[PDB]
C-alpha cells in the first residue's frame, strides 16, 4: 500500500521535472538522456526529504505541529535569494 504511493509520487515528480526540462531547454534544441532525468528525479526527491526533515524539526522547535512560513524562512536564512523568489 505504501510502495504504490512512493512509486506514483516519483512518477508525478518525474512529470514536473519533464515540464521543467522542456521549458528551460528548448530555445536551444538540446539533448538529454532517460538516465539524466532519472538521476535528477531521484536527487529532487531526496532533496525534498532533507528539507522536509528540517522544516519538521523547526516547527517542533517552536512547539507547533504545522510547518510555517517562518520555518521555511528559517530553513532559507542563509539564502536571501531563494527567500525572495520563493515569496510569490
Amino acid at each position: 500500500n505504501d510502495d504504490e504511493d512512493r512509486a506514483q509520487l516519483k512518477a508525478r515528480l518525474w512529470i514536473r521535472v519533464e515540464e521543467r526540462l522542456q521549458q528551460v531547454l528548448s530555445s536551444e534544441d538540446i539533448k538529454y538522456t532517460p538516465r539524466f532525468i532519472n538521476s535528477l528525479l531521484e536527487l529532487a526527491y531526496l532533496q525534498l526529504g532533507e528539507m522536509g526533515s528540517d522544516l519538521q524539526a523547526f516547527a517542533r522547535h517552536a512547539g507547533r505541529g504545522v510547518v510555517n512560513k517562518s520555518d521555511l524562512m528559517l530553513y532559507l536564512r542563509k539564502q536571501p535569494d531563494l527567500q525572495e523568489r520563493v515569496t510569490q
Binding site: 526540462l21 538540446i30 538516465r35 539524466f36 532533496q47 526529504g49 522536509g52 519538521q56 531563494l82
Partner: protein, 73 residues
C-alpha cells in the same frame, strides 16, 4: 505546477508515522523552491557539458548546487 498533498508525502519521507502538516501559505513556496531546484540543476548541468546531458553532467555540478541551494548565498 505540481500537487499539494503529494509534496506532503515526499517532504515527510524521512519521518515515522503520520505525515507532517503544512500551512496553505507555504505550499506555493515549496512548489517554487522545487522548480528553482530543478532549473538550477539543469542549467548547471548544461553549462558543465558546454565547458569541459548525461548522468555525468548532473554528477559534476551536484556538490555545488546543494551548497548554493537549500543553503547558502
Amino acid at each position: 505546477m505540481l500537487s499539494k498533498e503529494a509534496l506532503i508525502k515526499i517532504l515527510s519521507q524521512n519521518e515515522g508515522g503520520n505525515d507532517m502538516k503544512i500551512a496553505d501559505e507555504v505550499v506555493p513556496m515549496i512548489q517554487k523552491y522545487l522548480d528553482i531546484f530543478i532549473d538550477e540543476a539543469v542549467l548547471r548541468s548544461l553549462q558543465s557539458h558546454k565547458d569541459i546531458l548525461s548522468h555525468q553532467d548532473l554528477e559534476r555540478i551536484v556538490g555545488l548546487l546543494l551548497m548554493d541551494m537549500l543553503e547558502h548565498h
